Design a protein around this ligand. Structure first.
Ligand SMILES: [Cl-]
Ligand SMILES: [Cl-]
Ligand SMILES: [Cl-]
Ligand SMILES: [Cl-]
Ligand SMILES: [Cl-]
Ligand SMILES: [Cl-]
Ligand SMILES: [Cl-]
Ligand SMILES: [Cl-]
Ligand code: NA
Ligand code: NA
Ligand code: NA
Ligand code: NA
Lengths: 9, 236, 236, 9
């Protein structure tokens, strides 16, 4: 399954 | 600690450089040093902390899964005996993974969570607590497995309660929390129906709130909604 | 050393597991431990050593290039002053990269090269010596830069002399050596014409020998020949 | 430029 998360940078 | 002599702002700057260089162990060490300065983290700084450790533990989890699969195959009928090495090396990677989780949990407990009063920070940290207990649960096999699972559950549940009272249904933190708690239900807690129900309710309540958002916020929210959809497609 | 208590065969086995798990730092540490047992390496073991360190240093080189580019931009006219952090962090990565190169060079000098009598082993190790001096040369800026470059050149040249006397022009070790020495000429030694001439002669002399090979050897050789071609296309 | 290397494994 996919879980959360990307960088704001 | 080795970062004790470096300015807080310099640690943050170097964390950003480390990210650009794909040096995630360095990034995590810089961010741990920044946390240990004792001041609260801004939203940007929380996301640097999260990105750094998620990449470190992600590589460890991927390696652990490769090694665990080899170890399981070796224990099948007809498999030739190859000695203790596969178990030893899986245990080595496991111990390092557990150490990273313990490090993150330690930062959260000393003292990020207790100083976090705004909903966005407190939900963010409680979600992280759930996530790192979840990663511990992925590898747990002993007397404390049930307590590790319950620690993940309890952290996610507290985060959920705050997020539902204090954040709109499209808030990306809230969405990512619900996404991860749904994964917890499916993959850790043996509760696929709960996972599916949570993902579908989360998706639908976010859908109904999109009309309130700017174009940029809409993009942020719909990205995570698509992950909920992707999981629903896998699971149903 | 931390691997001193582990059997040679167990270190080799764990190096192979580490490769499958994409744990290249571990793989390199296991292979260093295996080398330090003092026995010669088989062809398969030499290639485990090479793969491990090439992945470790490759990540360091990629990070160094990112950071060096940021540092160069910061030194342009009109760039805002941001303090010592970019230089410091580039220097940190550089020092770690140099340490890995020194470690590899140390294994070669104590005592892999001196025990290597067959052409395939000796050329393999001399090529590696050239490669790791080349990586040192990529970051060198001081009084010893010329001597580092000459050390790379000398190692490659000795490997070339042996390979031309003792190996067919399609041998993949010979081809990869010539490929890398050509890169040395182009990127380190400021000798693009030499690089181009070497790549073209190597390619043509391999072409003429392909008819002697089995299907599997043909595949091995043509893979590296294509890299020679790709470089020629870049450079001309 | 491309330099040499694949695993036998
Ligand atoms: Cl910054
Ligand atoms: Cl081990
Ligand atoms: Cl609950
Ligand atoms: Cl549940
Ligand atoms: Cl083996
Ligand atoms: Cl630094
Ligand atoms: Cl020469
Ligand atoms: Cl030259
Ligand atoms: Na058997
Ligand atoms: Na064994
Ligand atoms: Na300015
Ligand atoms: Na600065």
């Amino acid at each position: 399954a996919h879980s959360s998360x990307a960088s704001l940078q | 600690g080795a970062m004790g002599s470096m300015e807080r702002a310099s640690l943050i700057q170097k964390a950003k450089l480390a990210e650009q260089a794909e040096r995630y162990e360095d990034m995590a060490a810089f961010m741990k040093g920044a946390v240990e300065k004792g001041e609260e983290l801004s939203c940007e700084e929380r996301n640097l902390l999260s990105v750094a450790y998620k990449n470190v533990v992600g590589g460890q989890r991927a390696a652990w899964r490769v090694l665990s699969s080899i170890e399981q195959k070796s224990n099948e009928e007809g498999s030739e005996e190859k000695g203790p090495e596969v178990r030893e090396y899986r245990e080595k990677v496991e111990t390092e993974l557990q150490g990273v989780c313990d490090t993150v949990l330690g930062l959260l407990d000393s003292h990020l969570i207790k100083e976090a009063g705004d909903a966005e920070s407190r939900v963010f940290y409680l979600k992280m607590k759930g996530d790192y207990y979840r990663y511990l649960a992925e590898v747990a096999t002993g007397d404390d497995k049930k307590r590790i699972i319950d620690s993940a559950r309890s952290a996610y549940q507290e985060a959920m309660d705050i997020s539902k009272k204090e954040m709109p249904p499209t808030n990306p933190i809230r969405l990512g929390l619900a996404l991860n708690f749904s994964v917890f239900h499916y993959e850790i807690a043996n509760s696929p129906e709960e996972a599916i129900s949570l993902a579908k309710t989360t998706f639908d309540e976010a859908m109904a709130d999109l009309h309130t958002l700017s174009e940029d916020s809409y993009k942020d929210s719909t990205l995570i909604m698509q992950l909920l959809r992707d999981n629903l497609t896998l699971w149903t």
